Design a protein around this nucleic acid. Structure first.
Ligand SMILES: [Mg+2]
Ligand SMILES: [Mg+2]
Ligand SMILES: [Mg+2]
Ligand SMILES: [Mg+2]
Ligand SMILES: [Mg+2]
Ligand SMILES: [Mg+2]
Ligand SMILES: [Mg+2]
Ligand SMILES: [Mg+2]
Ligand SMILES: [Mg+2]
Ligand SMILES: [Mg+2]
Ligand SMILES: [Mg+2]
Ligand SMILES: [Mg+2]
Ligand SMILES: [Mg+2]
Ligand SMILES: [Mg+2]
Ligand SMILES: [Mg+2]
Ligand SMILES: [Mg+2]
Lengths: 188, 177, 260
RNA sequence: UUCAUAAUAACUUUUCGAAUCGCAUGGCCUUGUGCUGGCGAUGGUUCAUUCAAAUUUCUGCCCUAUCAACUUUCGAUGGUAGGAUAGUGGCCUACCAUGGUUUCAACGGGUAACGGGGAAUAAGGGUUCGAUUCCGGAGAGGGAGCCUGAGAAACGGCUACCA
RNA sequence: GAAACUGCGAAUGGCUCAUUAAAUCAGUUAUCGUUUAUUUGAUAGUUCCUUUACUACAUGGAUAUCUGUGGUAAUUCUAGAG
């Protein structure tokens, strides 16, 4: 019943438009997903023209991507620490798009270990020659190593759990991460 | 009140009228799906046991399973539910329905006999109603026969013969799958 | 209206089906198909009205059902099939073959055209795109989706579908000095040569057309269908070749060519 | 154009990828129920096309100032992010900015106003009418709410209130 | 070939002008801002996952129609059994 038509809004001038027609079905709006953490529970909704949509309330784990070396891994979302729209979602741990969450960060860790093996936080000849060809080029910046030692990664979600049903995003990295720490240090 | 007893294995059933206030007393406060001994419902019902599966109120309203109420209530039924058949697709209808708890307001009690008793009923414990038609799907026929599947189930289909008065003619189902 | 509309009142039918404003409340709404209903022509109109082979709806239904109509080499047993421009209608009875081309008055005229050329069809390229797995394809005006076309076939161009296999046989590249047909507006049925194609950055291309009689007009590019090279049309143009004689010239034609 | 498309990494309470029907049942001989085999009918993912559907730009509306300021705490104008949407969009939320229209008549009031193609009238200019044979819109007693579907806020579909 | 299940339409058509004064509508644009049954044209080997043990010569269970027992004063009311 939640309409999104422009009729109920006043005109640009400000006049109160009289009711022209009772609100249609191609103008409907549905309830907010306001997703949570834990015990995956996705509800399908049959929208216009079939095309199943998936409400992703109570989602615990999802895919997350690392842009620098560009590798994606399934990992667990562990709480939300910042939301650019409403901090009330942060206090209620409501997970929507562009929210900022923490990551278990292990899968990235042993992927790094089996990929470069730099022993963060502080063999076959083929692998050794691959590492030699790499030539310690894995000079990833210091702050991500800091939270790797902490163990929880700072990721920003990019998928829309309200529509898609998935929980995908990317790690804050580069100046991105910097900016948000400032905001987080404002919270701190 | 009227009691509609049904034996499944014989496939038989009957209606029984009871007027005493005390045989039906045990039926009180018993919800659908429960089991009540036959000793307490009739001296001729020794050894018997009754599963209670639905009924009809004195106003004709049936009792829906899982209402857990001794009274009637208005419910919004749809496809999938009982006590309602939808005409249009997705046609929800708000209809009255009696609760699942048996009370004095009931007029018919639908009752399955589960355990064969001591004294036999007239045509229920004794007689057997034949199945009106056998299996149709090929593997269903094989299972109903235990036919060692690679045995050409083609011929083993049942064949019902009917006589027109002048011509005897056979009619047998088509086997699917 | 809530949903699609499935009735076409008689006055609302195009003035090129050019039916009778009386003797009926409704008109045949063309079913969904290869052509726009405003631009198409239902088979019932083409048979009952244009050809008079039938008499009414039941007769057209009986004609179509017994599989004597063949639209572009396919049966098309539905009464309101939108047989559009340049489609080919084959009747094995009377062994006759028609190709729908507008007569210069701007109407779907009955064009009895030979069997040998009835094998193929012409089409205008309306889109050239790259479908899944990097496979190039071309969409014509019929909605035919020809896969793997010639690499230098571009939009607005024309192609010669063999109509049997349904693949590309030859094609004509759109450019100045080229025989052309018009398929919309006042210039329906007109045939000429492209003199200039003014670009008009931002939309709605225009082309100037000069016919054999040395008359000149201008028409939208969506409205244009290259038909061949001057003096060598790739199809059999209808009677009159779309010169658009003036009303006084038509009167002189009536007076001069006159035998009773 | 971040388009079409392709590629890498991954993801999925893992969609589709024919366990479906009719007719004719030919050819090969590996001569068996063996191997293949035509014309269709229904389905079926995606991309097009068509019927469309939603929105959408500019300009155009009758009388009234004895309606001169109107709109914003309850969205009024804009920004950003999110939610919802099939999708853009204050469409809704959170936080900001204080904005938008107006003597070129805004806002309010009236319409025994549905808009239009058109009708009457006719030197020319016009005046009045247009509920109704076509195109649009809206409605099914007044109101709200919703299932099914591609498409309904349907009413010869349901739910509730009011009469 | 009844009935019923399945599929599809029932959102077309027909009627009325009550509401509505930048609202509808008309002409003209846009969708590189979206959904689209149907019609038409194309469209897919991978469903194996360690392939040296599987139904692919065909996998499972219900379910209406029907057979019989009812209820209500009655309604396109339908509960129980096979
Ligand atoms: Mg209508
Ligand atoms: Mg893209
Ligand atoms: Mg936004
Ligand atoms: Mg008017
Ligand atoms: Mg009125
Ligand atoms: Mg009117
Ligand atoms: Mg009136
Ligand atoms: Mg109308
Ligand atoms: Mg309506
Ligand atoms: Mg009335
Ligand atoms: Mg449908
Ligand atoms: Mg309604
Ligand atoms: Mg009515
Ligand atoms: Mg109606
Ligand atoms: Mg109904
Ligand atoms: Mg007003």
């Amino acid at each position: 019943g939640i309409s999104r038509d422009s009729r109920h809004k006043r005109a640009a001038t400000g006049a109160k438009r009289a009711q022209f027609r009772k609100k249609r079905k191609f103008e409907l709006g549905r309830q907010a997903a306001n997703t949570k953490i834990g015990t995956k529970r996705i509800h399908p909704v049959r929208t216009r023209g079939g095309n199943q949509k998936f409400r992703a309330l109570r989602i615990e784990t999802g895919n997350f991507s690392w842009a620098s070396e560009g590798v994606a891994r399934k990992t667990r979302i562990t709480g939300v620490v910042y939301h650019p729209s409403n901090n009330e979602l942060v206090r209620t741990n409501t997970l929507t798009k562009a929210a900022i969450v923490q990551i278990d960060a292990t899968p990235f860790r042993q992927w790094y270990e089996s990929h470069y093996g730099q022993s963060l936080g502080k063999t076959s000849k083929n692998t050794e020659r691959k590492w030699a060809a790499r030539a310690a080029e894995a000079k990833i910046e210091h702050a991500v190593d800091s939270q790797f030692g902490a163990g929880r990664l700072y990721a920003a979600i990019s998928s829309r759990p309200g529509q898609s049903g998935r929980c995908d995003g990317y790690i804050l990295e580069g100046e991105e991460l910097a900016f948000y720490l400032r905001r987080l240090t404002a919270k701190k | 009140m009227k009691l509609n007893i049904s034996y499944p294995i014989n496939g038989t059933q009957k209606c029984i009228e009871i007027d005493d206030e005390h045989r039906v007393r045990v039926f009180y406060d018993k919800r659908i799906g429960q089991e009540v001994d036959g000793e307490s419902v009739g001296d001729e019902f020794k050894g018997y046991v009754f599963k209670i599966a639905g009924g009809n109120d004195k106003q004709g309203f049936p009792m829906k399973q899982g209402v857990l109420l001794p009274t009637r209530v208005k419910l919004l039924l749809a496809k999938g539910h009982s006590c309602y058949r939808p005409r249009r697709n997705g046609e929800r209808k708000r209809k009255s329905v009696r609760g699942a708890i048996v009370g004095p307001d009931l007029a018919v009690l639908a009752l399955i006999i589960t355990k064969k008793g001591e004294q036999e009923i007239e045509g229920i414990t004794n007689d057997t109603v034949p199945k009106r038609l056998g299996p149709k799907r090929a593997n269903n026929i094989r299972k109903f026969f235990g036919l060692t599947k690679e045995d050409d189930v083609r011929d083993y289909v049942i064949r019902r013969e009917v006589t027109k008065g002048d011509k005897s003619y056979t009619k047998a189902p088509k086997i699917q799958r | 209206a809530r949903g699609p509309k499935k009735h076409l009142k008689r006055l609302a039918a195009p003035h090129h089906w050019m039916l009778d404003k009386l003797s009926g409340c409704y008109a045949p709404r063309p079913s969904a198909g290869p052509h726009k209903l405003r631009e198409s022509l239902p088979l019932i109109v083409f048979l009952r009205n244009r050809l008079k082979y039938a008499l009414n709806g039941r007769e057209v239904k009986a004609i179509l059902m017994q599989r004597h109509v063949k639209v572009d080499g396919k049966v098309r047993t539905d009464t309101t099939f939108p047989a559009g421009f340049m489609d080919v209608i084959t009747l094995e009875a009377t062994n006759e073959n028609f190709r729908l081309v507008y007569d210069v008055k701007g109407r779907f005229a009955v064009h009895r055209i030979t069997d040998e050329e009835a094998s193929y069809k012409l089409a205008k390229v309306k889109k050239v795109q790259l479908g899944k797995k990097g496979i190039p394809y071309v969409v014509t005006h019929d909605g035919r989706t020809i896969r793997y076309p010639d690499p230098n076939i571009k939009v607005n161009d024309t192609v010669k579908v063999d109509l049997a296999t349904g693949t590309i046989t030859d094609f004509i590249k759109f450019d100045t000095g080229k025989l052309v047909y018009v398929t919309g507006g006042r210039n329906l049925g007109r045939v000429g040569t492209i003199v200039h194609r003014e670009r008009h950055e931002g939309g709605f291309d225009l082309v100037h057309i000069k016919d054999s009689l040395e008359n000149t007009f201008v028409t939208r590019l969506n409205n244009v269908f290259v038909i061949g090279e001057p003096g060598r049309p790739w199809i059999s143009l209808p009677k009159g070749k779309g010169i658009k004689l003036t009303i006084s010239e038509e009167r002189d034609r009536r007076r001069a060519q006159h035998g009773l």
